[PDB]
Design a protein around this ligand. Structure first.
Ligand code: ZN
Ligand code: ZN
Ligand code: ZN
Lengths: 54, 60
């Protein structure tokens, strides 16, 4: 809920995307191929997010 | 919690953006120009999102 207390839209969208993807890894057995396929994006894409956020 | 339960990333991002903007609109009493500046985007952009995300705007 702290997300709604963030000022900038673009900051709040990253923080959310970081939480969503990290909370996703834990519920998908930290597998990139699996996670990427099941959150609806590519591997090269998910990988380029894992570094830009985590 | 509504959000984390969402399957796809592109869909959960839209729902968060919708909720984020709704609440920012509320706390700035639906002053569009002020809301846009506060959250770091152009009014024209904020308005595109308002329409795309199907957000209701009140206050006179
Ligand atoms: Zn800042
Ligand atoms: Zn599945
Ligand atoms: Zn301000």
């Amino acid at each position: 809920s702290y997300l709604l207390k963030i000022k900038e839209l673009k900051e709040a969208k990253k923080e959310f995307e970081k939480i969503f993807i990290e909370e996703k890894l834990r519920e998908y057995d930290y597998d990139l191929k699996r996670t990427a396929e099941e959150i609806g994006i590519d591997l090269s894409n998910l990988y380029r997010k894992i570094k830009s956020l985590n």
